[PDB]
Amino acid sequence: VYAWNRKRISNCVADYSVLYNFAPFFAFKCYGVSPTKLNDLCFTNVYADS
């Protein structure tokens, strides 16, 4: 946690319905958006912190 990995994701088409297959988690909690509306709207870049 003190050395969390940051990955920049850009220049690709993002389908957010495969993360459920990727990981066994209950809730795909989001703050500024809704989990089910993530395929219509689109951003500049997205950062993944692990």
């Binding site: 319905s17 459920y20 066994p24 988690f25 209950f26 809730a27 089910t36």
Partner: protein
């Protein structure tokens, strides 16, 4: 019915998704209760159910 753990949140009014769009759609004016409990000891078998 029986669903996955990821699709429990789709059984709710105003929710969209694979299950809520092709299998079971709830009305937006819904007035009722939803009960969900784990059945790993009943609906799961070794090698796949």
């Amino acid at each position: 019915f029986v669903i996955r753990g990821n699709e429990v949140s789709q059984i709710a009014p105003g929710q969209t998704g694979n299950i809520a769009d092709y299998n079971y759609k709830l009305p937006d004016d819904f007035t009722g209760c939803v009960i969900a409990w784990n059945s790993n000891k009943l609906d799961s078998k070794v090698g796949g159910n």
